[PDB]
Amino acid sequence: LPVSMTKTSVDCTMYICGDSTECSNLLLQYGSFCTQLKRALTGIAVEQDKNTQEVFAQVKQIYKTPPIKYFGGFNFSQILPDPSKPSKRSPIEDLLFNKVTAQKFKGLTVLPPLLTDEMIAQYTSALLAGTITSGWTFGAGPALQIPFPMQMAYRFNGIGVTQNVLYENQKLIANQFNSAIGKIQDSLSSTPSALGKLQDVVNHNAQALNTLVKQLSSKFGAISSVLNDIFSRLDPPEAEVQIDRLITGRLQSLQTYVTQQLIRAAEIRASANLAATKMSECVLGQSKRVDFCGKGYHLMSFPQSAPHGVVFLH
Amino acid sequence: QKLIANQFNSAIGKIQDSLSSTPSALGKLQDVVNHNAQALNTLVKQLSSKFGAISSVLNDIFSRLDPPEAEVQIDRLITGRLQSLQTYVTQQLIRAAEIRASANLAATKMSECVLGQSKRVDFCGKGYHLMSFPQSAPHGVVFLHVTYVPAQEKNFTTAPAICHDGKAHFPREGVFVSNGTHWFVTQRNFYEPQIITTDNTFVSGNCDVVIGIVNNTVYDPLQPELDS
Amino acid sequence: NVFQTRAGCLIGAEYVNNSYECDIPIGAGICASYQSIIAYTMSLGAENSVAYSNNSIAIPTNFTISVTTEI
Amino acid sequence: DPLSETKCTLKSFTVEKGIYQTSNFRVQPTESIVRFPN
Numbered sequence: 001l002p003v004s005m006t007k008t009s010v011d012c013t014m015y016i017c018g019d020s021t022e023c024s025n026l027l028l029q030y031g032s033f034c035t036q037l038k039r040a041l042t043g044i045a046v047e048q049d050k051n052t053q054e055v056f057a058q059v060k061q062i063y064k065t066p067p068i069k070y071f072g073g074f075n076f077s078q079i080l081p082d083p084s085k086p087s088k089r090s091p092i093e094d095l096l097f098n099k100v101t102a103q104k105f106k107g108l109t110v111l112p113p114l115l116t117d118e119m120i121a122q123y124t125s126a127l128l129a130g131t132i133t134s135g136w137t138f139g140a141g142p143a144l145q146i147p148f149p150m151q152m153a154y155r156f157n158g159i160g161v162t163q164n165v166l167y168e169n170q171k172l173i174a175n176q177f178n179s180a181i182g183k184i185q186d187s188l189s190s191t192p193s194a195l196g197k198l199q200d201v202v203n204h205n206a207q208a209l210n211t212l213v214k215q216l217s218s219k220f221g222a223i224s225s226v227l228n229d230i231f232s233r234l235d236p237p238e239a240e241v242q243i244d245r246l247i248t249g250r251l252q253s254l255q256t257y258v259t260q261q262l263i264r265a266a267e268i269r270a271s272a273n274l275a276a277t278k279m280s281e282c283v284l285g286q287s288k289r290v291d292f293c294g295k296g297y298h299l300m301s302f303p304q305s306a307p308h309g310v311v312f313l314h
Numbered sequence: 315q316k317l318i319a320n321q322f323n324s325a326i327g328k329i330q331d332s333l334s335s336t337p338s339a340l341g342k343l344q345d346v347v348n349h350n351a352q353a354l355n356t357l358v359k360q361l362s363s364k365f366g367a368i369s370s371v372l373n374d375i376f377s378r379l380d381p382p383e384a385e386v387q388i389d390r391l392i393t394g395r396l397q398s399l400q401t402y403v404t405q406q407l408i409r410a411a412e413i414r415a416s417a418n419l420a421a422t423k424m425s426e427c428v429l430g431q432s433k434r435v436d437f438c439g440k441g442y443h444l445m446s447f448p449q450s451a452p453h454g455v456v457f458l459h460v461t462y463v464p465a466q467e468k469n470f471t472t473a474p475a476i477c478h479d480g481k482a483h484f485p486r487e488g489v490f491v492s493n494g495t496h497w498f499v500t501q502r503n504f505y506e507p508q509i510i511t512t513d514n515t516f517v518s519g520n521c522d523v524v525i526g527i528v529n530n531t532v533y534d535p536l537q538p539e540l541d542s
Numbered sequence: 543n544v545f546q547t548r549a550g551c552l553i554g555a556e557y558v559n560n561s562y563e564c565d566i567p568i569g570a571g572i573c574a575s576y577q578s579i580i581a582y583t584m585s586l587g588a589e590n591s592v593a594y595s596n597n598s599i600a601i602p603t604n605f606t607i608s609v610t611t612e613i
Numbered sequence: 614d615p616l617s618e619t620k621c622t623l624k625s626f627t628v629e630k631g632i633y634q635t636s637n638f639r640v641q642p643t644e645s646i647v648r649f650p651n
């Protein structure tokens with residue numbers, strides 16, 4: 001599930017005009033579109049930060065997993081943080097980062113996100129520790145520790161299967177779960193199209209920005225696309241008309257870009273709300289809604305971070 | 315009952331006080347208004363832009379110049395104003411779509427948390443949901459969620475099942491605990507210890523397959539009755 | 543009183559090794575607050591540790607009725 | 614002053630707590646040069 005897109009900002013005068021000075025003087029009579037554009041872009045940026053904080057920051061405590069990682073035959077090494085790596089990330093998170101991938105500042109900028117990747121990884125690790133050592137009670141009050149097999153017995157009792165079924169087939173279920181985790185790791189490694197959504201978001205944003213910067217080199221019916229050439233060539237009364245046409249065309253392009261950005265931000269915000277709902281319901285508890293948290297009868301789920309998104313293992 | 319009622323009254327009084335104190339609590343509604351007016355304000359400001367023409371005064375353009383280029387100036391003014399109005403309409407449409415989504419979410423909350431009890435976690439308040447109340451507000455609705463939260467936890471030693479006469483007893487609805495000397499069965503969310511019997515536990519197989527089983531006796535209520 | 547962050551350059555605020563809740567977000571994990579003006583790294587929350595073991599449980603013995611608001 | 618520029622940008626005499634975008638800076642050229650063929 002994607003969560004947030006790239007926080008962008010645009011410099012009006014350096015894009016609409018060039019290195020010349022009198023072009024800004026000509027602009028000063030055209031209105032205050034720069035204010036509207038800046039307001040819209042800051043709104044989008046703060047919405048992106050709000051989306052990320054809403055999706056991830058849902059616990060007021062930072063739990064730590066116990067040093068001894070024994071849970072009655074269950075193996076969580078593939079999802080828990082690995083201290084060996086300097087970045088303190090799970091192997092699945094590293095694979096996700098490696099599976100997902102110029103610098104022409106012509107007034108176009110990219111604002112950094114408020115929450116660094118390390119902080120998001122810390123949130124995910126805290127969520128994993130809480131959901132492992134305390135079941136679901138940590139999502140509705142103080143965390144209470146429960147042995148993991150007892151938690152699995154509770155979860156089976158949730159879907160309508162008695163506890164003795166688990167308590168008699170503990171080792172087989174543990175083996176199945178470990179094999180499933182390994183198979184998920186391998187399948188995600190060997191599938192190129194599995195991560196289509198986040199790559200699609202990145203490609204859309206980069207392609208839109210590239211289209212914007214490429215459109216600057218269009219004549220728009222003028223004699224030339226270089227304003228400095230126009231000013232040094234014609235009588236200013238008619239060079240004024242030429243520059244007026246150029247400015248109107250470029251402003252129309254910028255308006256189109258802003259509108260597309262607004263629509264994409266709205267869609268991404270809807271997706272982020274869906275992701276927040278899934279995190280609240282499927283992770284911090286057990287859900288009886290069909291197909292909301294995976295195919296089949298639901299038992300639990302685990303979160304993982306990803307570039308501009310989250311990945312749920314149901 | 316009496317303690318719960320006192321806690322409820324104190325909680326609702328605290329809610330009234332907190333609402334009366336914090337000024338930012340109603341930001342979400344206020345922002346809506348704080349958006350609309352200012353956007354409208356911007357539109358009015360756009361009426362005072364020359365849009366690259368010689369003057370921003372239309373009748374001045376008529377009076378001071380002959381029709382040939384006055385037509386061009388008026389066309390420029392009309393195009394600029396029409397474009398500004400179009401932009402305002404589009405922005406209003408986007409805001410309307412967002413508001414409609416929020417209204418649908420509010421309708422779902424009213425249908426589920428108010429007219430019934432919902433088991434969705436964190437959907438109708440933090441903690442175990444009990445019930446809720448609606449209240450009106452300028453261009454909005456305020457929900458008061460009444461919820462239940464445990465506190466004053468205590469440590470205990472637990473076991474999955476009990477082995478007795480080569481049979482395995484599992485709790486029917488509760489969980490086994492022990493203060494250190496004796497074993498009891500209690501409900502999950504509240505410490506209410508009870509004597510373990512054969513009516514609140516069920517038997518399945520022998521006690522040689524489960525892991526962590528412990529040894530203890532299980533009282534039978536019908537034995538004293540048959541004794542007499 | 544000159545600081546270098548990932549976002550850019552900050553003039554007029556001093557970096558502090560302490561940590562608090564974010565008040566005025568700057569970016570890249572850096573926030574600012576007034577107490578003069580200071581800048582720091584935001585703290586995610588209060589650290590906690592659970593006493594997990596193989597056969598121990600925790601059971602509540604009291605409850606609390608809470609009321610929350612949602613606008 | 615930067616505070617004065619913020620006040621002018623918001624078109625008010627009082628600005629609430631937060632971070633505001635005022636303008637942009639660009640270093641101006643120092644001198645001029647010219648190069649033409651022999």
Ligand SMILES: *[C@@H]1O[C@H](CO)[C@@H](O[C@@H]2O[C@H](CO)[C@@H](O)[C@H](O)[C@H]2NC(C)=O)[C@H](O)[C@H]1NC(C)=O
Binds near residue numbers: 076078
């Ligand atoms: C839990 O799973 C991990 C990996 O799924 C196991 O780590 C493997 O351990 C064996 C023997 O120590 C090594 O030969 C493998 O190379 C390890 N896997 C990897 C990916 O490095 C681990 O043994 C399992 N059990 C526990 C208790 O952690």
Ligand SMILES: *[C@@H]1O[C@H](CO)[C@@H](O[C@@H]2O[C@H](CO)[C@@H](O)[C@H](O)[C@H]2NC(C)=O)[C@H](O)[C@H]1NC(C)=O
Binds near residue numbers: 493496
């Ligand atoms: C564990 O609980 C049992 C059940 O209450 C306790 O046994 C009784 O404790 C009371 C309290 O002093 C005594 O008056 C009774 O005489 C005890 N029962 C018997 C049969 O002797 C037991 O003491 C508790 N254990 C601990 C360590 O608190």
Ligand SMILES: *[C@@H]1O[C@H](CO)[C@@H](O[C@@H]2O[C@H](CO)[C@@H](O)[C@H](O)[C@H]2NC(C)=O)[C@H](O)[C@H]1NC(C)=O
Binds near residue numbers: 528529
């Ligand atoms: C629970 O009680 C059973 C029955 O008394 C114990 O099983 C005996 O264990 C001893 C010691 O290992 C053996 O010599 C006997 O042959 C066992 N008898 C049977 C019928 O199994 C069991 O060890 C007890 N468990 C605990 C934890 O005390």
Ligand SMILES: *[C@@H]1O[C@H](CO)[C@@H](O[C@@H]2O[C@H](CO)[C@@H](O)[C@H](O)[C@H]2NC(C)=O)[C@H](O)[C@H]1NC(C)=O
Binds near residue numbers: 317320321604605
């Ligand atoms: C459960 O908690 C409630 C409140 O958290 C306790 O009620 C308090 O009891 C003390 C002593 O009796 C009084 O001084 C307080 O005024 C009570 N609080 C309220 C809000 O009325 C209650 O005693 C606790 N239950 C147990 C068994 O300890």
Ligand SMILES: *[C@@H]1O[C@H](CO)[C@@H](O)[C@H](O)[C@H]1NC(C)=O
Binds near residue numbers: 068070595597
């Ligand atoms: C007790 O806990 C330790 C570590 O938590 C574990 O290694 C051991 O197997 C547990 N004992 C039993 C009987 O489960």
